[PDB]
């Protein structure tokens, strides 16, 4: 039924689902504490992405396990667009590359690319939902049915992105060029997340399946 | 940047490297103990061909030597991997490292960390199969990896980066043209383009895991100066 939404209805839903900007509460203690509070709101966001809560709870958790760090990063990048050379983790926590620096420079470069492209908010929220759905889709009959559903939702977000660029009055050549540019930034965000996740796992901190499930607040029947 | 889409596809098809073979050395038959040695030799021989393929990707040799090396240092494992997945597409459940080196998932449960990567490779092969990926699309995807993977990692640098994005846009055009010319609708074109490019996030993911597996041998990774030597040919 979420697959009957129009592109306009898909955009409004995603804009309405957007999480709040949190405030910061040892730089590394503060970043971890900020991440942990953001995760809760990301779970609330995820449930409002059309199509997501039609999946089993088991597969929602898996998507969330695979994607949460990418989602944290693209949001960091989004809200840093307007602050060249700085990362706005929170309104009370702007850091530059002087205050690890490899991932920091990668984040800054992503924010610079979003600036060069004049990434719009409507496009940004489509990109987050693609990240949520795409990041774990490579990992039974029921499993196969779920991946079919995920790809249908992915296709409709692609339709939506294109719709926005049409509305913006880009030519069809510019639409598919810009679509491609945006999706290629997602492979760099995947790269950035791989580095963080290796770092967390090295600690021997990564949100467990049970913690994510608890946050999803499953229905009681 | 002057080429048509047909011309782009023509050049990429023409530059395709050969399918290489694992050694048929009788003094070194296949066993689980000889495996990473055979696989390493094969990759080392493929890298040589990959260098000379890269130089034939339109736009690539327009870059500085320094940047060409940086792009290859970022992308070589992803390019090996996508070549592997393409070779394996028509053999469900198996990875076709070479025509004489076709492995299944339990042959992979020899080394620690290996089965996990094997399954991601097999999943990618599965995805190619159900998308019925075409050869002409494959070569576009491989060239996007080459140009894209190191680009996010100075006046000359700003010109380099402008140039790389203009070549990516041309490849994007070429991909759409391929799909247009087959007969896909505009909707199907944009949906397929998106499907194809999202696979590149997984390939990056796999390359990071594989890169993590390779350093876990502590032997293997081509250094920056080694790659530069390979690309820095005389005339
Ligand atoms: C839920 C798991 N709990 C265990 C903590 O895992 C964490 C801990 C910290 C981060 C922060 C964080 C916080 C908020 C944000 O919006 C974004 C980020 C982005 C991020 C890069 C990834 N990060 C860093 O510090 C950083 C920045 C620059 C270079 C190297 C590292 C994310 C996840
Ligand atoms: C040029 C750099 N020096 C050489 C050392 O790096 C190497 C050593 C070995 C491989 C093989 C290899 C060979 C050929 C191929 O086409 C592709 C691959 C793919 C690959 C994943 C990476 N691999 C493995 O064994 C493997 C497979 C599954 C799960 C875990 C590991 C590649 C690179």
Numbering used by the authors:
A (entry chain B): 306 to 330, 341 to 414, 421 to 460, 465 to 529, 533 to 549
B (entry chain A): 308 to 460, 465 to 530, 533 to 548
From the paper:
SERMs and SERDs are comprised of a heterocyclic core that mimics hormone binding and a side-arm that disfavors the H12 agonist conformation.
The T6I core is superimposable between the 10 structures but the side arms adopt divergent vectors near H12 that correlate with ligand-specific antagonistic differences. Interestingly, the F425 in H8 is rotated away from the ligand pocket in the T6I structures compared to laso and RAD1901.
